[PDB]
Amino acid sequence: SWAQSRDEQNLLQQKRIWESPLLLAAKENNVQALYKLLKFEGCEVHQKGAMGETALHIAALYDNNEAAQVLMEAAPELVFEPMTSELYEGQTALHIAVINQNVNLVRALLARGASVSARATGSVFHYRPHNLIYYGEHPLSFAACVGSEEIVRLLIEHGADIRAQDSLGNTVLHILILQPNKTFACQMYNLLLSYDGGDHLKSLELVPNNQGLTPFKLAGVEGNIVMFQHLMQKRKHIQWTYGPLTSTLYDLTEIDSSGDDQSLLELIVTTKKREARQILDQTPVKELVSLKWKRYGRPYFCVLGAIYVLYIICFTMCCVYRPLKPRITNRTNPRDNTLLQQKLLQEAYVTPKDDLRLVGELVSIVGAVIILLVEIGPFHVIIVTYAFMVLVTMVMRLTNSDGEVVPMSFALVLGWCNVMYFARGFQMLGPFTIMIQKMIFGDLMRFCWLMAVVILGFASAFYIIFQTEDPDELGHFYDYPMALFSTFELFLTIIDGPANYDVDLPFMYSITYAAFAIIATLLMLNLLIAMMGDTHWRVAHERDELWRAQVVATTVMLERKLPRCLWPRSGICGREYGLGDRWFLRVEDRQD
Amino acid sequence: SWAQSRDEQNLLQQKRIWESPLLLAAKENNVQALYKLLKFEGCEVHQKGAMGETALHIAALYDNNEAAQVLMEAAPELVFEPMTSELYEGQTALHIAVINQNVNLVRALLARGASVSARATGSVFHYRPHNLIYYGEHPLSFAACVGSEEIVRLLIEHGADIRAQDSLGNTVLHILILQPNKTFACQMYNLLLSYDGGDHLKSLELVPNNQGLTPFKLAGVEGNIVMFQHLMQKRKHIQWTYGPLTSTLYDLTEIDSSGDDQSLLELIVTTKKREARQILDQTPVKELVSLKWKRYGRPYFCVLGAIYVLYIICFTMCCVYRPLKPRITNRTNPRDNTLLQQKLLQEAYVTPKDDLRLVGELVSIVGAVIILLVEIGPFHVIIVTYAFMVLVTMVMRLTNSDGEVVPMSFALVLGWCNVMYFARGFQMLGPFTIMIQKMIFGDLMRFCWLMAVVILGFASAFYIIFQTEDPDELGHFYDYPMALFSTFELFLTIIDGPANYDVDLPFMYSITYAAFAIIATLLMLNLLIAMMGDTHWRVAHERDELWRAQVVATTVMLERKLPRCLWPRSGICGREYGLGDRWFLRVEDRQD
Ligand SMILES: NCCOB(c1ccccc1)c1ccc(Br)cc1
Numbered sequence A, B: 001s002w003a004q005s006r007d008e009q010n011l012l013q014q015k016r017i018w019e020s021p022l023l024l025a026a027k028e029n030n031v032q033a034l035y036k037l038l039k040f041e042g043c044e045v046h047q048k049g050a051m052g053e054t055a056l057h058i059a060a061l062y063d064n065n066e067a068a069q070v071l072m073e074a075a076p077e078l079v080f081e082p083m084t085s086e087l088y089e090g091q092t093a094l095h096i097a098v099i100n101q102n103v104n105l106v107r108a109l110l111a112r113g114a115s116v117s118a119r120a121t122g123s124v125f126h127y128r129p130h131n132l133i134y135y136g137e138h139p140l141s142f143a144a145c146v147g148s149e150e151i152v153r154l155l156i157e158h159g160a161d162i163r164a165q166d167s168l169g170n171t172v173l174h175i176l177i178l179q180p181n182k183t184f185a186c187q188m189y190n191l192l193l194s195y196d197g198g199d200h201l202k203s204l205e206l207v208p209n210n211q212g213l214t215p216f217k218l219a220g221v222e223g224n225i226v227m228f229q230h231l232m233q234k235r236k237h238i239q240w241t242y243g244p245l246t247s248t249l250y251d252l253t254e255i256d257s258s259g260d261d262q263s264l265l266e267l268i269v270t271t272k273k274r275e276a277r278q279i280l281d282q283t284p285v286k287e288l289v290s291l292k293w294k295r296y297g298r299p300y301f302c303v304l305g306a307i308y309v310l311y312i313i314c315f316t317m318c319c320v321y322r323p324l325k326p327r328i329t330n331r332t333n334p335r336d337n338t339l340l341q342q343k344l345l346q347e348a349y350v351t352p353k354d355d356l357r358l359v360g361e362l363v364s365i366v367g368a369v370i371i372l373l374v375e376i377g378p379f380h381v382i383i384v385t386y387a388f389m390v391l392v393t394m395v396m397r398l399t400n401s402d403g404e405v406v407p408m409s410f411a412l413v414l415g416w417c418n419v420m421y422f423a424r425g426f427q428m429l430g431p432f433t434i435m436i437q438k439m440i441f442g443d444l445m446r447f448c449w450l451m452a453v454v455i456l457g458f459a460s461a462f463y464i465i466f467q468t469e470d471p472d473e474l475g476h477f478y479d480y481p482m483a484l485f486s487t488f489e490l491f492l493t494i495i496d497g498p499a500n501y502d503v504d505l506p507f508m509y510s511i512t513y514a515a516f517a518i519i520a521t522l523l524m525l526n527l528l529i530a531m532m533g534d535t536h537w538r539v540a541h542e543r544d545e546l547w548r549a550q551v552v553a554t555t556v557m558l559e560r561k562l563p564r565c566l567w568p569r570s571g572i573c574g575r576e577y578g579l580g581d582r583w584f585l586r587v588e589d590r591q592d
């Protein structure tokens, strides 16, 4: 494994440190042992340890400014030495001094002429979930993350480039967005803006990420609220202060679906970051999406909903009024227990009341392909397999198979179970369907593994008990599978329970079913209690916040496929008004 | 829309401000730019901006006492200039100085001779839910709302009229009732009472609203407790202090149903304000309604309840003993599955045991019209459609239609479901029926939309599965609608479940019903969890408070329609005792 290789090399280093006396005296900061190894007896002052480190590299891991100076005064070429290992390919002696906030060592490494543009492209400096931190590649980025504002400026003094981007195309600003101490990263974010060129164009706040992300837009996708609140102060204008009233005018540029994507909205609903869902609830955005929904958002969702309501009640009207036949097969020639009345009409006659079905069968197929023409959570897979069964039934039609009902049946449940997708929004039943959305595709697929276990023990028992018994009277368990289906129903107490009192029940049924009734309830009562984990107070706020999440998500969906002769752009643009042509939304509020 | 017009005009103003250099220097407070535009080069000092504003109006929005003075020293006619726009029709320069608490500018606008009676009848000053604040029309009202007691008195010094009413007939006192800072509005409420005429008649606390509402009575309907507690100190008298005992004597005038309405009680239960329900729980009122119910309130509600109990068990006794006939229609001439035994007797014979039914049918119709004679929450619509079905059944009688049972049946459930209305009060089952009152008319009408969706997908499936099958044995789904009714019951597991083991179940029933059983439970279990939102601790207090709400509501109902030879007036009047003829209720309490 990889998690053990670094554990071993961290120990193989200590071996070579313990083995190499130069690296040892540099670790133990033994001043009276380096000169015994560098001046009297000239040892290998360029000693590469296990991790390709030098004596100065070891003298920097542990703040040994003495051992560092001894190695820089007896061999001033060790400062320019980078780590020559795989785990630290790029790290130098200045990196460790800036990380350790060794100001007097950064001040001394810079007085020695260290490089302020050395990238630390080692594998331990990467952005991985198994790595604990991530500060970047450039030493200025490290000073920016540790908070040592004295070192941040001290690196700029010696020619540090803020425009310098790492391998991920991240400036020093983007790195400050992925840090915990947001309340102190703001003061460091502003300190890094004061060294800009001072021009309104090619600004550092406008240098986008390699994934097309400005430092302002990244704070929204990552869930960073404090930096999103701090970055908003740079892009908002206040109009007037009328006592408690303050009508502020927000910029609303990258926070708008203007670019095809190139929108903060289209990035909050699409990310899997749970913290990001709190960003559309911020005061510059919440006034947008609340006005994007109170008008022209809610009625259009009711238009597509009502259309799909009628498109589904039409498909059902074509199934209750479909071809008929009093069964052309002779009789019950196979098995006598045959309730078969095949209803297949290959012909296109019946024109009186079938010409109404002719156009009806034509609408459901042109709508099914229209459903697929606009496609080339869980409610997304229900609508696509619905129209898939429509074309397969059209294939079972014109071929008229005896299984002409199995493909036609799946389209009934999927047509309506996808019309409860419109409960998302509309009224307050939205969080109810987002609650079952976590249930159908969360616990159910895991809870059934425990119920099938209980059924496959009792169903296989009730079959052997009534295998000796005659299935004519009390034949709940007769087939191999139907013995399980009756046990499945009996696990839900839908059936009366195999209660035949005229016959003599076998001695093992009156014993096994009692054991099934208790355990079936103890798995039902323990399932009801298992749902109480989402009841304290935040979970009512989480799903209501997640309902508003999928509410704003659907709101942005309709803005892209609908035309533009309706549904205007958010706010008011900057033309015919002394503005910068960018949008703006006038939101006045009141304090206390 | 209207919410965008103000957004545009707020930007069209900034254009004309940016365009007009006079309005611009007045905004930027550029003293060295107004004299360049008023004295050297005489610009249009009366420059009407986009919002009909003057340079002084702009010099007042932002506290620019310099720019204001420059415009009032070079053109002293701008003080009398009101806003000539539609959004601010009436606002002047003094309005903005009082709102901004610009004491030295109010002191200067008043030294310039500004008007202290200018109404600000603009559309943005109206009492609307989309407007953020509401302070009134008169400048004294604005000083009263902002709290600047130095400006409140400074306006009275220059002839401010407290008796001045706005368009809504509201004095300065009524405006202080609709403010958040109640704990500081009290000190401002008292400051505005000290400038009254000093006479006990035509007092400002007695100037009613245009809707017949004194400032004391408004605090109760609005839910304002702190001003209701503060206004009570002016109308209560203490009798004696016996150590911890303090027998206080409350006024009880407008807090009584003396006037036809002209009562604080009749206004708390009728308003939709949830905060107002906390007012009948106040210590001057709670002692009233608790004594209005412990005697003569509870027994009379038991009288009308017992009367309606017997009036309903009588209507049911007339249906179980109604006309009879062994069915005059030939046989089962239509369809053989006909269980019909029509019971229609158009004749008025049968006098032995029917003369008991004759008067019985006469009581239910004279009571049904009596129910309507006293009419010319949800429990209000149950009693009226009940008596409506009584008259329609009387119309189906004397005409003897074959649907003589459909109108007679609706009156059975409505007669009893309206006798559980008497659970409101009586004992502690009141909050149980006010809980189902929010359920029958709250979530049910919304939750059924999601269950019909699930049923209309599976019911329409189980019909096509058993359309090929013979409905003789396992005919749960045979008709177009009955296939849905059986699925509806199966959604509630009332039915055994289509469990026929003698026949061979179709391959698609043994698959679709399993999918129905799980999803039917996952919509049932997710409905049970959805009821937990009313369980933390305040919701048990909210419905118990709402139960007491509908308890006090019913208490005031009986006081109006009942006669006066019983049920005396609250408290003891002020005659034969040295009192003011107004109630009073002697309520002694104990401190600690
Ligand atoms: N192009 C398919 C339309 O998208 B939809 C959609 C619309 C109607 C029926 C089913 C799916 C969608 C929207 C938000 C989420 Br989350 C998931 C699906």
Ligand SMILES: NCCOB(c1ccccc1)c1ccc(Br)cc1
Binding pocket: B374, B375, B377, B379, B380, B383, B418, B421, B550, B553, B554, B557
């Ligand atoms: N005039 C009808 C009598 O009023 B009632 C009423 C009395 C008996 C049966 C049904 C209604 C009423 C009282 C309070 C509320 Br809240 C709603 C209805």
